[PDB]
Amino acid sequence: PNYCFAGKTSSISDLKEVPRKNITLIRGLGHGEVYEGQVSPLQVAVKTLPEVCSEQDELDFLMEALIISKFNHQNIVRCIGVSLQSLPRFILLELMAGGDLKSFLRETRPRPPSSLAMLDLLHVARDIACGCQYLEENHFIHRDIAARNCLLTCPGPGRVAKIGDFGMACAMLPVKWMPPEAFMEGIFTSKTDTWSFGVLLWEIFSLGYMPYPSKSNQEVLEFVTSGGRMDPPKNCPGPVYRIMTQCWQHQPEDRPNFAIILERIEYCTQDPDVINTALPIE
Ligand SMILES: COc1cc(N2CCC(N3CCN(C)CC3)CC2)ccc1Nc1ncc(Cl)c(Nc2ccccc2P(C)(C)=O)n1
């Protein structure tokens, strides 16, 4: 299997094979399965392929390794290497100690008080938008920009958010992150990623709520097609909500590219009225 990105073609032979003897598993992290690990010492996350799997599962795994290995950006998770010549097969990734963003948001929600502030949220949004701008500039369509696919380097301040999973690149389709022309026509473009980014913003500023809270997939599809959009998250500043509503323009041509999203995020970050807004206490 071959893979091309940024005008270069790569195959399995170009991946960095790490000797199996140099890899130590430490603990499970979530769902294949992902472990904390060590490479002789580098801390890694280890994505494993079940030994019992289809040929297409094997190929899917290979492709995910080539895709992640060829990216070179600070807001995309690094691939340390692979161990594909012993079973089970491993992909070695940068350990993101802060976890997935969805869990982080849910678990770090202000409770009775200042576990998070608005600037933390804007920094995460900026980081992911920089990641997406890098993809868009390199003509890569992610297809599943969502909080569950983003990771944080560390729990505390100085955390950096990064795009972590590239699995997507009917009942399993992430309808709630997809614009009309994607779920209706199966047309994907970089404006597809813009729409999803809008939904991720909502996830961020809601502190990890499921989009379109009470609606099923079909309800969302009919709602969104008819021009329905989500309400602002609780205490969401107007300038932030305006970015969401621009990302959710019906016409792909009317949605901003990531360079523009980034500028608008940076303007929000500069506005004292935005960053002095208190997050809701649950
Ligand atoms: C310590 O590092 C982690 C911790 C957790 N946590 C988050 C809280 C969770 N909580 C604690 C509190 N408890 C009561 C309920 C559970 C426990 C696990 C999750 C993930 C990583 N790291 C990590 N790096 C790289 C990758 Cl690449 C990855 N990948 C990854 C790991 C897990 C899920 C999804 C992915 P993705 C996006 C789809 O690749 N994952």
Side-chain angles (χ1 to χ4, degrees):
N2 285 336
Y3 170 64
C4 187
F5 174 74
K8 312 292 153 163
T9 298
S10 268
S11 68
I12 189 177
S13 70
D14 309 313
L15 299 165
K16 179 69 165 160
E17 179 76 7
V18 174
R20 177 56 57 108
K21 53 168 275 172
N22 297 348
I23 304 165
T24 304
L25 267 35
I26 295 172
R27 52 170 70 84
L29 299 172
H31 294 276
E33 180 69 22
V34 187
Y35 297 80
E36 183 173 332
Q38 277 210 1
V39 174
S40 44
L42 278 206
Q43 302 178 288
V44 302
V46 187
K47 304 199 74 176
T48 72
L49 183 65
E51 287 195 52
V52 297
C53 71
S54 67
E55 262 177 332
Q56 191 55 64
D57 286 342
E58 288 270 21
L59 172 56
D60 283 7
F61 196 71
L62 205 84
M63 207 58 38
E64 176 158 73
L66 292 167
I67 292 166
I68 189 89
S69 297
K70 293 330 296 166
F71 293 137
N72 173 31
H73 195 273
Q74 325 83 65
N75 303 108
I76 295 171
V77 171
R78 307 295 189 164
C79 183
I80 281 85
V82 299
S83 177
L84 300 180
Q85 292 303 112
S86 305
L87 297 163
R89 306 215 205 282
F90 295 161
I91 301 173
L92 312 173
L93 300 177
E94 174 176 15
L95 182 62
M96 302 289 288
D100 69 292
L101 172 57
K102 165 94 170 150
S103 310
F104 172 84
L105 287 170
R106 283 171 35 83
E107 269 155 78
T108 321
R109 270 163 193 179
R111 287 165 199 91
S114 299
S115 57
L116 276 173
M118 206 61 79
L119 192 66
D120 297 298
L121 298 189
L122 285 166
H123 283 171
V124 165
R126 177 204 57 204
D127 293 351
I128 299 309
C130 287
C132 290
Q133 183 195 41
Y134 170 82
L135 294 178
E136 166 196 315
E137 275 167 347
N138 290 100
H139 316 292
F140 188 94
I141 307 169
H142 187 279
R143 292 176 171 247
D144 194 19
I145 297 302
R148 68 181 166 269
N149 291 327
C150 296
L151 301 150
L152 298 158
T153 48
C154 66
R159 72 189 68 82
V160 181
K162 313 192 173 186
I163 304 166
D165 174 285
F166 290 87
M168 273 277 168
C170 167
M172 286 183 64
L173 207 64
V175 167
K176 288 183 192 187
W177 285 264
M178 279 168 336
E181 76 277 3
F183 61 67
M184 294 304 276
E185 286 293 319
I187 298 294
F188 296 80
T189 75
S190 269
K191 292 302 182 74
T192 304
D193 283 352
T194 288
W195 176 292
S196 301
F197 187 78
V199 178
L200 165 74
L201 271 188
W202 190 96
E203 290 185 282
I204 295 170
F205 283 87
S206 78
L207 301 173
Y209 281 68
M210 180 60 54
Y212 307 89
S214 71
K215 295 207 209 306
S216 70
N217 274 3
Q218 188 61 28
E219 276 157 6
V220 172
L221 191 156
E222 287 163 6
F223 182 69
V224 159
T225 294
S226 295
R229 305 293 184 262
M230 286 186 279
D231 284 336
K234 190 69 228 168
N235 291 9
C236 183
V240 177
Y241 185 62
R242 278 188 277 295
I243 301 172
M244 298 179 200
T245 58
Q246 291 168 330
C247 289
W248 300 331
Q249 291 300 299
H250 187 92
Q251 318 303 148
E253 302 71 20
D254 295 330
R255 306 168 193 146
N257 68 23
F258 279 103
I260 299 295
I261 287 154
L262 270 167
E263 286 175 21
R264 289 174 188 173
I265 293 172
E266 279 155 30
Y267 203 84
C268 293
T269 305
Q270 289 180 288
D271 180 352
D273 285 327
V274 170
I275 61 179
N276 285 319
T277 303
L279 283 180
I281 314 289
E282 180 192 65

